[PDB]
Amino acid sequence: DTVEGYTVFGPPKPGDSKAFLDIALSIASQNVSPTRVSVWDIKIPDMT
Numbered sequence: 457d458t459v460e461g462y463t464v465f466g467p468p469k470p471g472d473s474k475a476f477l478d479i480a481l482s483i484a485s486q487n488v489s490p491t492r493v494s495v496w497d498i499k500i501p502d503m504t
Contacts, residue, residue, distance in 0.1 A: 468474045
């Protein structure tokens with residue numbers, strides 16, 4: 457530990473949000489992102 461074990465970096469402080477990274481990675485799932493109808497094709501509704 458004396459030579460190899462010691463590192464400048466310490467344990468994360470509370471509220472750091474780093475402790476939740478790799479819990480977010482497991483949660484993370486890719487989104488399909490489907491194709492929508494182009495805004496130029498939707499007709500604006502007539503409220504008159």
